[PDB]
Design a protein around this ligand. Structure first.
Ligand SMILES: O=c1ccn([C@@H]2O[C@H](COP(=O)(O)OP(=O)(O)O)[C@@H](O)[C@H]2O)c(=O)[nH]1
Length: 390
């Protein structure tokens, strides 16, 4: 089998689920360890998953309950991953991981004990160890060793392993994969070591809800607005609904983890939970979003013009890429006004940008999980998987 693990928000998780589902399609018994947020997501695509640790979404936790990334709970997190992974990693021939470092180091430790290959994956080029300075890598290593090195080493001893240090190097490896689209996120030409697979995208077969189908059929193509797993700007729903209205468009408002909702009873608005983005984004006039490596990839592949309203990370990088590609607008700052979002939308709603977005869509590959599957085949070899890829 193959074990796939991670701890993070939806963007850290969805690519992993994509890889797991692809591996199962290719005849490999891929299974996962993920935070409990993702139970429904894995089940609906037929991927076995073992929940590990605290929920990542605040609203999924108890009041006052700290997130898995909180420094205060790191000892517990390390213990939990060492407790729950052994049953899942049994019978596995390789492990692929992204996300939270203390969890990743626990997972690599268990891979090391079993003598099976471990691969870490990053989702945007700026996160590659080789894109950090030496001083930065030193700093990350020292921080990790100091914060949770003792806990990791205690659990390593419990399974007979020697101590390890430089936990950033250890968790990320010396050459993590880059599961990111090369058009959207180009890798510098001098980097020969990084394997850039393309984004890991699950071909989404889920139907749209009856309510969303009805909404789409009942009028002109709407504008989607959503902020994904992350925070939304002050007055986000009001500003976005009013700005979209100003452009003579209907609104699909994704509640997201921020829990956005309608501002009135207007029938020109539909509030949605989880949706099939691949399908929906082909049926909207534009997408206002946080940029989100995964969301940006989905929008770009769907060919919808964009307004990127970056909040944190990472996200300003994607806003800039979208603007550079000419397929959308990089909103100036994290907090739109009705005026600023209206202006950005007007630009994103031209026939020209529609054509540009349509063209760039065809350049975005969706077979990154097949590249990853082949990489796994070669790592394990050094059966049904070789046969399926042939
Ligand atoms: O209703 C939704 C919300 C999210 N996604 C997918 O979840 C991923 C979110 O990726 P991103 O990197 O933007 O994650 P975030 O920053 O929101 O955690 C993308 O593949 C989205 O298309 C989806 O299919 N439907």
């Amino acid at each position: 089998g193959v074990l796939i693990t991670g701890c993070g928000s939806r963007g850290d998780t969805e690519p992993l689920v994509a890889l797991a589902a692809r591996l199962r399609e290719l005849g490999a018994d891929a299974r996962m360890c993920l935070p409990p947020d993702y139970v429904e997501r894995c089940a609906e695509v037929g991927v076995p998953m073992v929940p590990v640790g605290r929920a990542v979404r605040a609203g999924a936790r108890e009041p006052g309950e700290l997130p898995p990334g909180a420094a205060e709970v790191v000892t517990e997190v390390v213990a939990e991953w060492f407790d729950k992974v052994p049953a899942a990693i049994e019978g596995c021939d390789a492990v692929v991981t992204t996300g939270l470092l203390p969890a990743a180091v626990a997972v690599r430790s268990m891979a090391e004990k079993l003598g099976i290959p471990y691969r870490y994956t990053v989702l945007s080029p700026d996160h590659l160890p080789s894109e950090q300075s030496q001083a930065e890598r030193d700093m990350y290593n020292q921080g990790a060793d100091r914060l949770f090195g003792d806990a990791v080493n205690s659990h390593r001893a419990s399974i007979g392993l020697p101590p390890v240090e430089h936990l950033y190097d250890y968790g990320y490896t010396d050459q993590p994969w880059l599961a990111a689209d090369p058009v959207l996120s180009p890798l510098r030409p001098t980097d020969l070591g990084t394997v850039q697979t393309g984004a890991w995208i699950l071909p989404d077969q889920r139907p749209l809800s009856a309510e969303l189908e009805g909404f789409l059929r009942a009028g002109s193509p709407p504008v989607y607005v959503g902020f994904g797993s992350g925070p939304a700007p002050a007055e986000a729903a009001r500003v976005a609904i009013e700005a979209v209205r100003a452009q003579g468009r209907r609104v699909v408002l994704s509640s997201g983890w921020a829990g956005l909702g309608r501002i009135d009873e207007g029938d020109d608005c539909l509030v949605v939970g989880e949706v099939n983005h691949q399908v929906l984004f082909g049926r909207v006039a534009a997408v206002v979003h946080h940029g989100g490596a995964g969301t940006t990839t989905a929008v770009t592949r769907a060919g919808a013009p964009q307004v990127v309203v970056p909040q944190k990370a990472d996200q300003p990088y994607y806003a800039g890429r979208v603007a550079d590609l000419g397929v959308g607008v990089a909103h100036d700052g994290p907090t739109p006004t009705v005026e600023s979002l209206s202006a950005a939308l007007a630009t994103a709603l031209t026939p020209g940008i529609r054509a540009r977005a349509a063209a760039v869509a065809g350049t975005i590959r969706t077979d990154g999980t097949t590249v990853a599957a082949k990489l796994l085949l070669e790592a394990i070899s050094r059966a049904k998987l070789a046969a399926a890829l042939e």
